[PDB]
Amino acid sequence: NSVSVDLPGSMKVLVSKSSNADGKYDLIATVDALELSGTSDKNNGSGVLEGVKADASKVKLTISDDLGQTTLEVFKSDGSTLVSKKVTSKDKVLGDVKFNEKGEVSEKIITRADGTRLEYTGIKSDGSGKAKEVLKGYVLEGTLTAEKTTLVVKEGTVTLSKNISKSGAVSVELNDTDSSAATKKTAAWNSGTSTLTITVNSKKTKDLVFTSSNTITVQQYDSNGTSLEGSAVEITKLDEIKNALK
């Protein structure tokens, strides 16, 4: 009979134990009560399965040859224009995409392997939109363009801008409208260490590290302004980021 194969994206497919006369394997899957079926020229669970929703929407599940990626698509009833696409890649990152009534990308939610998210909404034909980053304990809000995602935190006269380029590189900057030389914050970004160093009155006050684990840490400098003291503290709420900008 059949063998179960575990799939990325919390799905299972049943593959026939032997091939048919064309050398092909039968595939069966049930995705949220919808039965999908297909035929594959591989034996491991990869290939294409199809079904039809009760509202006549077409559904297709594509499993990559190495079982590393799954793509679950919903189309309009003639199967020609996309409604939604959910892609789990081999790093277990999830891409959740909605399309407008003409099947152009309208909304995209990226769920990282650690569960943090980038939520892109109201996406227009120039790739611009609204953006939100969902971190552990807090949320950052901003905009999207074809060039970058910019998430903004404001505290007093200080604006902190976290940039995620179209390819995923992070840069951070700080602007302060304060004109007093004694209290105005300025800042320098070190991309190599993903660290923003804040300075007040020609002395370093703190390092903000934007880590590869999608967290922010804050570490203070000593009263001189030249060396770090203590240890970095992980931000766990938006208030703590704002406090670092005071």
UniProtKB/TrEMBL annotation:
Protein's name according to its UniProt entry: Outer surface protein A
Family membership noted in the UniProt record: Belongs to the OspA lipoprotein family.
Subcellular location: Cell outer membrane; Cell surface
Domain of life where this protein originates: Bacteria
Listed GO CC annotations: cell outer membrane; cell surface
Pfam families, per the entry: Lipoprotein_1 (PF00820)
Record SUPFAM superfamilies: Outer surface protein
Keyword Zinc-finger assigned: no
UniProt key word Transmembrane helix: no
The entry's keywords: Cell outer membrane, Lipoprotein, Membrane, Palmitate, Signal
Record membrane topology: Lipid-anchor
Encoding gene, per UniProt annotation: ospA
